[PDB]
C-alpha positions as CSV (number, residue, x, y, z in Angstrom):
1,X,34.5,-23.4,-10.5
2,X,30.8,-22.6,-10.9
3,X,28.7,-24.4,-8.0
4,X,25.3,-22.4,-8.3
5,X,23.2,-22.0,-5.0
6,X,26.2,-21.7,-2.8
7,X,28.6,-18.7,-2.9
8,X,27.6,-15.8,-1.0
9,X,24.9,-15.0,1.7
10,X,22.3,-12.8,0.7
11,X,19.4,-10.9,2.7
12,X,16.5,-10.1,0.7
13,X,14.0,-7.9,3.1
14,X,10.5,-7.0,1.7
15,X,8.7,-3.7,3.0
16,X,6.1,-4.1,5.2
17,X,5.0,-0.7,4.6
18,X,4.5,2.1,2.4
19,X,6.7,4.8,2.9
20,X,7.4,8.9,1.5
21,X,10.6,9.2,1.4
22,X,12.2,12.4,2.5
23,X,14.7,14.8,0.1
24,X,17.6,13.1,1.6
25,X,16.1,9.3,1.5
26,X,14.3,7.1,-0.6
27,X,10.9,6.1,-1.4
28,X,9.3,3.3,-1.7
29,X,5.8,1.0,-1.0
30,X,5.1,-1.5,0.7
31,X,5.3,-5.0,-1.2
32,X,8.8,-4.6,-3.1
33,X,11.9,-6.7,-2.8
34,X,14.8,-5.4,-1.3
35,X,18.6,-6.8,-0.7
36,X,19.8,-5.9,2.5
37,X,23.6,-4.1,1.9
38,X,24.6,-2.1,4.4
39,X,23.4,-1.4,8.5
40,X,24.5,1.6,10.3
41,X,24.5,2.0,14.0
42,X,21.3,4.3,13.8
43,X,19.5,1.6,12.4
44,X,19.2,2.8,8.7
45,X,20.1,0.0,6.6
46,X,21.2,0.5,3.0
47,X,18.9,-1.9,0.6
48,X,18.4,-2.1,-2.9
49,X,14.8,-1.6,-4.2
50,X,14.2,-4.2,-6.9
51,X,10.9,-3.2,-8.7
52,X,12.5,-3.8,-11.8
53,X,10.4,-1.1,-13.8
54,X,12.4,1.7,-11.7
55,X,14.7,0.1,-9.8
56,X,16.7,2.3,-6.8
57,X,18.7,2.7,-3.5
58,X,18.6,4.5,-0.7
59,X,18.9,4.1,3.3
60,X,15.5,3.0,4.4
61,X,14.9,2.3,8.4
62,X,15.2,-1.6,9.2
63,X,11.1,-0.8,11.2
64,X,10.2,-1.2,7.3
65,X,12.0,-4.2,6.8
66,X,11.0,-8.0,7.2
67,X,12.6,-11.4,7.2
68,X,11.3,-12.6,4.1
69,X,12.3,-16.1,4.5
70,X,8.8,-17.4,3.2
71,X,8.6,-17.4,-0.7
72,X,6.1,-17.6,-3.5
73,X,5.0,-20.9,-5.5
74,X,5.0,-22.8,-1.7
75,X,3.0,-26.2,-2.5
């Protein structure tokens, strides 16, 4: 039963900034695609960093986060 587009929600955030990334989180730079995963109460959000050369995860803080509900090849 293999429909295609429909199955299960997704949230793919991209970083609106370039950040450092302390010992116990992860770094990262702003204009990567991440999938939203996990939200804590504190507001760190658990993503997945999708550069592809060196992909990652790591807690990063939702303030780096937006909606990226726009997408490339719009004409």
């Amino acid at each position: 039963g293999s429909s295609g587009s429909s199955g299960n929600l997704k949230d793919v955030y991209v970083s609106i900034a370039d950040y450092e990334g302390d010992e116990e989180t992860a770094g990262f730079q702003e204009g990567v695609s991440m999938e939203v995963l996990e939200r804590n109460p504190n507001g760190w959000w658990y993503c997945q960093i999708l550069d592809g050369v060196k992909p990652f995860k790591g807690w990063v803080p939702s303030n780096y986060l937006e909606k990226k509900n726009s997408g490339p090849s719009s004409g």
